[PDB]
Amino acid sequence: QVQLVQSGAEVKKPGASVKVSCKASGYTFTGYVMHWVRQAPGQGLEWMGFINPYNDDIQSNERFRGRVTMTRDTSISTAYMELSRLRSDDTAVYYCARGAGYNFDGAYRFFDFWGQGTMVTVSSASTKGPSVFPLAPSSKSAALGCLVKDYFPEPVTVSWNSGALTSGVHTFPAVLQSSGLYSLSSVVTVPSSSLGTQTYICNVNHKPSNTKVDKKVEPK
Amino acid sequence: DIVMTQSPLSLPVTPGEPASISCRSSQRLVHSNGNTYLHWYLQKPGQSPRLLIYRVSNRFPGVPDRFSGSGSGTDFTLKISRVEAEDVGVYYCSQSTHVPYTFGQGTKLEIKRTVAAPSVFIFPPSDEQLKSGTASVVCLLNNFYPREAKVQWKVDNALQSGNSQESVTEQDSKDSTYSLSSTLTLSKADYEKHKVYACEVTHQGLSSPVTKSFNRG
Amino acid sequence: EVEQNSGPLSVPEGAIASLNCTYSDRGSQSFFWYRQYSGKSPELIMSIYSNGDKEDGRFTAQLNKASQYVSLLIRDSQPSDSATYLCAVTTDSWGKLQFGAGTQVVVTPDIQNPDPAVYQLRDSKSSDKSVCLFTDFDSQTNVSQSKDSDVYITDKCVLDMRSMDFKSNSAVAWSNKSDFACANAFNNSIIPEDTFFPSP
Amino acid sequence: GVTQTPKFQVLKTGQSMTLQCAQDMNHEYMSWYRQDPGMGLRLIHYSVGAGITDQGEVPNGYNVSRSTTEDFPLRLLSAAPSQTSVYFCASRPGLAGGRPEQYFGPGTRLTVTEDLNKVFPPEVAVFEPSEAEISHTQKATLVCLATGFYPDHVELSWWVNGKEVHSGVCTDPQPLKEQPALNDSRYALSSRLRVSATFWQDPRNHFRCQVQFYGLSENDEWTQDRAKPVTQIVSAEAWGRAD
Ligand SMILES: [Cl-]
Ligand SMILES: [Zn+2]
Ligand SMILES: [Zn+2]
Ligand SMILES: [Zn+2]
To answer: What is A3-122's CATH superfamily?
Structure first.
């Protein structure tokens, strides 16, 4: 039960700083090194650096030397990365990735366990929470969904009946409107009959605005 | 830095056949301690990467034995014996001998499970969105192959263009099909001035252009 | 409940070691003694049923059912007797065999001709690596544990060259610090003033 | 009498274990104990005869089954670090009459860890007897050192001219923790072999210290740069020197 659990998504204006945390569970924290790797949207992978939390030894990628700051707190089993003087082209997903070498072994040069990641958006534009509208089921013998419109920045997450309904769902990649705000749809297929039986609710979360909405989706 | 160069960036292949990705480095990758630190990661949709092969030929625990690596000097090769539906994703080769660590561009795997038509679903805008002066109509295609589709919105049989965007999901893990979501955006004012709303859907898995429609507003 | 005499018991080579055992219920019928060496299984050595003595080799088990008391004496106690001895009791022929905690016995050897000394020995494959040996010292000299975390000191252990008639104590100590020679190694122990320290 | 395998075993949290116990006596009663430094012996399970079993003092994580009269295995469901212990198999005749004597088996030493990268083999070194000890006493002491092993599952032995030797040796009863504070520490062990001066100084005599280490198997998986810490013998040696 190795688990690396990172901090939630954030938004920062150009020239500012962001601090991403990564918290380990179910192993000896000091035994393994901790790397950081990023992914810009629709792009490849880039390695930033590591921190060996035993001896505080550090390597870094030349590109970030001056701007990046990797630290660690052994009492709480957490590693940090702090990047600053943020340009717009630092908008990306930021992962923490554990090295496979226990106690100075050479296997640290590859990664065996990753975190869930942290989307960091660099923008002068304001934060804005979404509006959630139902996509009511057809009058026809069965698909319904939720429309999440006008939010910034990314991302959001959608679940159904507090995570109970999982089969048949497709949550779509967001779409950048001309207004500068994001919008996506989530849909799901269910049995023809069971519209009168079941009571469907979509749970939308947008953490940068601190918005939680539990919207009913029913025929009219 | 060491540049990493993968051969086919886009590799489609039918289930049960051999698949082979090449990878290539600007320098040799033998560390002073004798090992060759070259690896293979796989990224599926909505997930972080996962290690398959490490130090050229060693399979990671959990990985099926149909995956295997090889190579020496500057040329390295990932090989899959029997390609299956769960293999879909992006395959990165990586180098860790020298600093900084550098990856390849990534190679997407498409699976050539063939011909299947969509299940269309139109949606009228909600009663609560219409209060705030905008109207979104949504046309949902669902579970189709190949990816190539075309949606034409029509309002009172007038072909609308340049006022709708579409978004498409990745190829699925199990059924190996895509899904699509187009969205026509109008004002509340213009929405009420028409009545017949429809999306026309052409696809090589269908005989003739299927269309679904409604009427209010 | 089966209660034994507590702690680790120290007995000189050749002397007698007394072990006791007491049990709760009067219904008890069979009574056993077991002998467990370090990192090994218990071995049955004695059994009594009726009151009085039962002698076997150097062992003498004794029972008194009225006082609910059981004993084991070890005459002419040898260092090989060093082990922990368990007392065990039952009511029935198929009733639950209730064991005791156990009593550790340590038989210290009679070092007749002591000659305490600290020698330095070098690794077979590296003159660099070396170890300090404290040897030929009298019983009732206790070696203490290391204070420093990077200096390793083992407890005293008893030797026996049977072709001769010779037994010796020995303790081993080593470290990776450059700040370490055999002169300072056993400074945490109270050792004989007598002790021999040859040139390194 | 009683048979018990395996002798040593290392295990990861969540794995399942099977402890074999056979016996060529025709005994009806058979039980399982566990011994920990604090409590002493503790009854886990027992069986009055073939086809019936029952729960002893500390049974929670354990499963027993008395199929035949001879055999009586013990099952561990999901290994925990609390279940690191030594396990003993016992057997009385149990019949109404004579000989109520319980006999124990050799025992099985079990260690359980969060992750198997913490296991290491022992490094072994032989240290040659000093010139001063030879001069002062007319005797020569070799010393052997088994360093940095985990878990605590090791059997040290001394050899002379190809035959094992017990006379004039002693090995530590307990091994040292290299890192006493942390409870998953590696271990150290020393042993000695004393020999007459004349015997050491014959250049034809050869000495060898062996340590059988019980670690992983070839089945267990390993992602590490170093060699897999498998069950093995590590050993070091020295010839006599006539100086
Ligand atoms: Cl000690
Ligand atoms: Zn530089
Ligand atoms: Zn129009
Ligand atoms: Zn119009």
So the answer is: Immunoglobulins (2.60.40.10)
